[PDB]
Amino acid sequence: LSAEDKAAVERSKMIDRNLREDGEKAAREVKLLLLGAGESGKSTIVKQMKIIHEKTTGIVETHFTFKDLHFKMFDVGGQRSERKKWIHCFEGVTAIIFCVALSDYDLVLAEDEEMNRMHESMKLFDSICNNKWFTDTSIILFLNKKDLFEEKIKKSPLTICYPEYAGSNTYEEAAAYIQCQFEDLNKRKDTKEIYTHFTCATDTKNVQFVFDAVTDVIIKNNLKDCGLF
């Protein structure tokens, strides 16, 4: 009820309505977190998504649009500090795009103490999936390099990894075995969903899969908000 105090409340309402308009525009974006092993095919996935819209390390954002839906995909590979001190920042991401290279069941890590790379990827998957911050976050699993898989699945038997295996050294019944082995690590199988896909070097069939999964994720979020539940 003053003269100089009037241009201190209208300014606050200007700022408040600008913030309100900016807050509902960022709720229409789909935020994804990319994770992967030392070399699983994350770069080739980023290349496949075909980014359209838009010392110095850390987050590497990537914006694109598919069928009127804006995706922003955060890749954290330049952050080599402790994971527990910043992993809770991405507590409200829509989904996770964990990538695993199929043709890694024969090699070992460059650190050279003789463990399977596939086993290490499984350990990372079960250390990320069963987390306190990610208890309802859906996971999109990509199993890249299925063309190279049908080069080593003939000469090299699977028994090097998962020694208990029921034979059938072919493409089928071996990729399905790996998919089941990865999906068995879920401790909340009745609440949390995992969408698996074999990608190889397929074209315009990966962004479609991501779109199909995030559609279900958005529907589930709206269901939880409605009251259904």
């Binding site: 300014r11 606050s12 913030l19 960022a26 390390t57 402790e82 001190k85 910043w86």
Partner: protein, 336 residues
Amino acid sequence: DQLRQEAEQLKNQIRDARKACADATLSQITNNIDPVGRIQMRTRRTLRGHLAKIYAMHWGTDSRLLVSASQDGKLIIWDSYTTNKVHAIPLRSSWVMTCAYAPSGNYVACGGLDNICSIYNLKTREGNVRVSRELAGHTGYLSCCRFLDDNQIVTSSGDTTCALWDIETGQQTTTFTGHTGDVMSLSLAPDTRLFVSGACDASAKLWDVREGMCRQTFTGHESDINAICFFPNGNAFATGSDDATCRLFDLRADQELMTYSHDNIICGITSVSFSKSGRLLLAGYDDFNCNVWDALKADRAGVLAGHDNRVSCLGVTDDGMAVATGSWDSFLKIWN
């Protein structure tokens, strides 16, 4: 070679000249003085307008002005005597975990997972906030930043090093190394000639701004140190860690003085601050609460419940009138 055997012998020498100096204990003294009683505080104001978790907060140099950073890309400057939003600044990266207010009234600092410290000019010639500088050179996330002056600023990051910058030229004037883990928290002495850093290897170090060499190292915690603050006298400091306990260290005695811990508390400490006189020690917790401790006797003199997700930032005004607490629900509360 074997010069490592020279180590663990000088450490034994320091421990030897750290026990004969302990004549008494701060708990034995301060027995005669009466307790402060029961501190009851009321939430006078509630500031809302953020749309995500609030990660940092700083107070204006005099009073009445506060800056807050949240994980939605907005830096909000409020006037606390009212609930007016003086400023709102959009950030280039929405992953920020620190903020600072210059002790002059016109500058702001921000930093986060992008490894860049952004310095914003508040009062310009046109009235619109513009990015005055973008200091780069860290190889880890920025964890803390404090304004030494209107031209210098001290930053602590997950690179496991600290840096004294030069805003005009944007170059690292000095680099402080020696920590074996990510430097999580940083505090500045009242005279701005020393500063302490608490890192993830359960240790704290007392540096020297002018020289650039560590002088004393304080251990005694078990897990990572998340917050640190300086005693108003300038001859002691307090730290908070993941052990759900706070501790008070002394510069001159080169020793621990007291441990502020209690049962029914297992969560962990995110923030720590001192009262104007130095008798109360406020500490935020992961259990959604904030506790006030009688610093001279280590008795819980009060609880500041009223949040529902966490307490990530906590500050006390220069005059000591009010206490501001931010939470992981886009809410700041001012208690008196």
